[PDB]
Structure formats: C-alpha cells, structure tokens
C-alpha cells in the first residue's frame, strides 16, 4: 500500500500527487469534496468502511444525498465554516449510522493544496 499515516501534519502535500488508483492504496478512507460538498474522489477503504461503491458515489453530494447523518452542526457545520474561511483542519469522533450498522470512526477534515477542494479522512476506532 501507499505509505501515509492518518493525522499526518503534511498529508495534503503527499496526496496532491495521488491519482485515484494510488488513493485506493491508503490504509485509511479518503474523500475529496468540493466547496459545495460534492464528491470528486472516493477511495476503496472508504467503501470497505461504509459499504458504498466509490465509482457510483462520485458526483453525488456528500451532505445531501450520500451521508445525511453528517448534515449537522458537528460535521457539515464545521465543514462549511472552513470553506467560508479558506481554512479547515479539524479532527473528531463520529458515528456513521445511515443505512448501515452503526460504525464509530475518526474523521479528519483538511483543506487540500488544490484550489477549492477539501479532504475528509476516515478510519475505524
């Protein structure tokens, strides 16, 4: 697999280089979202965790369509404050419970090195 640790101080630079095939080699789940919350990249691990087919969920909206349980102050709200502000670096625990067995995970949200995109990283706790 590709060699990146979850929570890494420099991780948005490491991932800048990665295409989707290479994203699927991470030991953790990775979503790339535009400033409107639309999914642009969605890695195999995230599929293993949540049970979605990444190919199919690219292009859908994370907060409206795919993961409405994250539509709340304590996830989306933090997401949008960061898009509003041009800056976003937060880590927290959450339970994913929409159309799946309830699964507690660690979420890390970080502004990408790209122009207007943001990362969401996920792993089991």
**Count: domains in the chain:** 1
Helix residue ranges per DSSP H, the chain:
11-15, 20-23, 44-50, 54-57, 78-85
Resolution (A): 1.6
Range of the domain at 99: 1-125
Which bin fits 86, alpha (ψ -120 to 50), beta or left (φ > 0)? left
On whether the CB atoms of residues 32 and 40 are closer than 8 A, the answer is yes
**Separation CA 6–CA 68 (nearest Å):** 24
What technique was this entry resolved by?
X-ray
On whether the CB atoms of residues 121 and 6 are closer than 8 A, the answer is yes
List, edge to edge, every strand of the sheet that includes 103-111: 39-42, 29-34, 117-124, 103-111, 89-96
DSSP 94-109: EEE-SSS--EEEEEEE
Give the domain CATH number at 13. 3.30.450.20
């Amino acid at each position: 697999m590709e060699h990146v640790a979850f929570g890494s101080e420099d991780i948005e630079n490491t991932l800048a280089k990665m295409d989707d095939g290479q994203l699927d080699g991470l030991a953790f789940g990775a979503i790339q979202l535009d400033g409107d919350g639309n999914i642009l990249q969605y890695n195999a691990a995230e599929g293993d965790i949540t049970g979605r087919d990444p190919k199919q969920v690219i292009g859908k909206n994370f907060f409206k369509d795919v993961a409405p349980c994250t539509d709340s102050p304590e996830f989306y709200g933090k997401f949008k404050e960061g898009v509003a502000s041009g800056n976003l670096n937060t880590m927290f625990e959450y339970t994913f419970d929409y159309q799946m067995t309830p699964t507690k995970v660690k979420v890390h949200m970080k502004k990408a090195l790209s122009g207007d995109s943001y990362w969401v990283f996920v792993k089991r706790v």
